[PDB]
Ligand binder design. Sequence first.
Ligand SMILES: *C(=S)CCCCCCCCCCCC
Ligand SMILES: [Zn+2]
Lengths: 5, 286
Amino acid sequence: PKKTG
Amino acid sequence: KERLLDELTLEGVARYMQSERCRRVICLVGAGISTSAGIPDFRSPSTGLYDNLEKYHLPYPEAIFEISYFKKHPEPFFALAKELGQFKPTICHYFMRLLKDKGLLLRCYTQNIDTLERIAGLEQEDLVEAHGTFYTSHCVSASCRHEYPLSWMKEKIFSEVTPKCEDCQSLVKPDIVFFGESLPARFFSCMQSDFLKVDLLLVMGTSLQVQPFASLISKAPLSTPRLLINKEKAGQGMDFDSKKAYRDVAWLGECDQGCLALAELLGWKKELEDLVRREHASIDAQ
Ligand SMILES: *C(=S)CCCCCCCCCCCC
Ligand SMILES: [Zn+2]
């Protein structure tokens, strides 16, 4: 859902 | 698991694409398709454009694109932005344009913020800009949300004055999705419809490391062929090599050459190079 990595 | 590719090669993918069974292609694209424009891949291991930013003493390079760090220390990001519009779309971009003009393109999902897909002539309907765009900018405070155009932002960036809202003095942020921010609603809305009906996933220039974007490879049905055009294998679920491999194909090299090799096989090499030439000459003559 949240931009990660 | 129905088997739709006769063989797991580029030629097999090319034959499937020319078949009646392949009507709907989705492209997932990342930083690899824009590196020949000159936009460096900022997650690649050997990347060569944080060089200048040593003065800002970053906790680590990636912090520059973290929303929490950015809001308290915007300067490193804008100094990077001044080094980098001047970029024309690449062969990869025009190959997608070609897929659209031939009626194969269902959608292009892009991780990139450079807007090169729109310049190449993909319309807004055909694009899901998963991480937003540099094109428009906004004051970060909920109760102001003043919009500023690229024109305004570039003036601020080139003068090395941190962009600030003329009304409420808050930070002005380009409409991109920083790490730790939410993706546009369009991304979640389009994925629910698009992936039910897709006949081929083309994954170009992405190491599939950024979530949730990377999870899009899982969303197509199990029979859907998936071609990875990239410098190295990625998304390994993507099964290229095991004895259970049935639908995923890897073409390892620079994305531009992959698109030329693929286009060659479809009989479009000539139309593609002609398109690229005309589109570039039109941007030059601007
Ligand atoms: C998520 S992967 C998006 C990260 C944002 C990268 C921004 C790169 C610096 C801006 C360079 C300007 C290009 C026209
Ligand atoms: Zn404001």
